[PDB]
Amino acid sequence: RCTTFDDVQAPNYTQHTSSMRGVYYPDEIFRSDTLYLTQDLFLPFYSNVTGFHTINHTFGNPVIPFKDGIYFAATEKSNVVRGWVFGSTMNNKSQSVIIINNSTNVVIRACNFELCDNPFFAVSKPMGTQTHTMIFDNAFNCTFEYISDAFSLDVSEKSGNFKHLREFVFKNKDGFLYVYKGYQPIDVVRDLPSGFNTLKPIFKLPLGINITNFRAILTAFSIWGTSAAAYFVGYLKPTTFMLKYDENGTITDAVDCSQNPLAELKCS
Amino acid sequence: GLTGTGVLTPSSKRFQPFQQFGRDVSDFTDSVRDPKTSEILDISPCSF
Amino acid sequence: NYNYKYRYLRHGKLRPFERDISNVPFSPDGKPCTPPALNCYWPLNDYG
């Protein structure tokens, strides 16, 4: 069932600053004590940040395109917006990939999928039983299925500090699927703190479809529910970067070239 | 996949769980997390 | 071997390591059709 509700309006397209967030471990390889150069589809520093300021007045999941490198951020409160189904036509006639949980364990399938206009997690307000998580409806001419580890993973409706921070990068490479993660406990009102953190290679799935467009998945509080918050979106752009690696073997200072003529001479 | 020639000796470092290689100035791997749980350096220059 | 097929119709060129099954009622500018209505075919083709 496209169990699709009534409070989705068109937004004001609110944009913010992309100071230094979005750095990851570029390889499996140690370095130390240099400025190392390479080029990648990265988020440009200081640039726009797509802030999606979903509150009780506005639920936010439109059509969401990939468009050549992406970045996900959410100052979570017990991990509300889990679920990534990536594909082309977002229907039965897209073999897509469903990337969801049984609240402990990552369950992923890639197949023709009954991709409804709204399937979700019908999560309650005080306890959190996903009443209507029926997303594995149909699967024919399938391709793939994957199950990770059961790990500690909370759902329920909360507020307070922005203690959880899902910082995700989902990167493609010739079908291969690169999953980065880095935890960073923060608390600003919901204005964006600046900063920088290593993102770290959780996963690969080698899938390989027409990876065009998608949506998010949230937990609809069976009146749906989001609270006084947002979530931040970026794209990647293929430019060349210089990193300053310490003797402690850590990402410490990432500096682009093409942002700034200053940054160009720095990497020069 | 790494043959080579030199001297080995244990690390003094801050290694990572996914990690294997170190490539000191370039393409050298510098170190091995041994495939049965050790983490040592590399000094391929024996003496010469 | 009428059993097995390939596809020979697409908008544009391929990208490495990608699979799409979708037997589109293919047409040069969209047109979700009932083939073989004219300028509307399918990409699939047998082996013989």
From Swiss-Prot, chain A:
Changing I223T: In strain: Isolate BJ01, Isolate BJ02, Isolate BJ03, Isolate BJ04, Isolate GZ50, Isolate CUHK-W1, Isolate HKU-36871, Isolate GD01, Isolate GD03 and Isolate SZ3. Changing N210K: In strain: Isolate SZ3. Disulfide bonds join C2-C116, C111-C142, C257-C267. Glycans are attached at N12, N48, N56, N92, N101, N102, N141, N210, N248. Changing S222L: In strain: Isolate GD01 and Isolate SZ3. Changing Q130R: In strain: Isolate GD03. It comes from the Viruses. Residues 1-268 form the BetaCoV S1-NTD domain. Attaches the virion to the cell membrane by interacting with host receptor, initiating the infection. Binding to human ACE2 and CLEC4M/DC-SIGNR receptors and internalization of the virus into the endosomes of the host cell induces conformational changes in the S glycoprotein. Proteolysis by cathepsin CTSL may unmask the fusion peptide of S2 and activate membrane fusion within endosomes. This is Spike protein S1. The gene is S. The chain holds residues 18 to 289 of 1255 of the full protein.
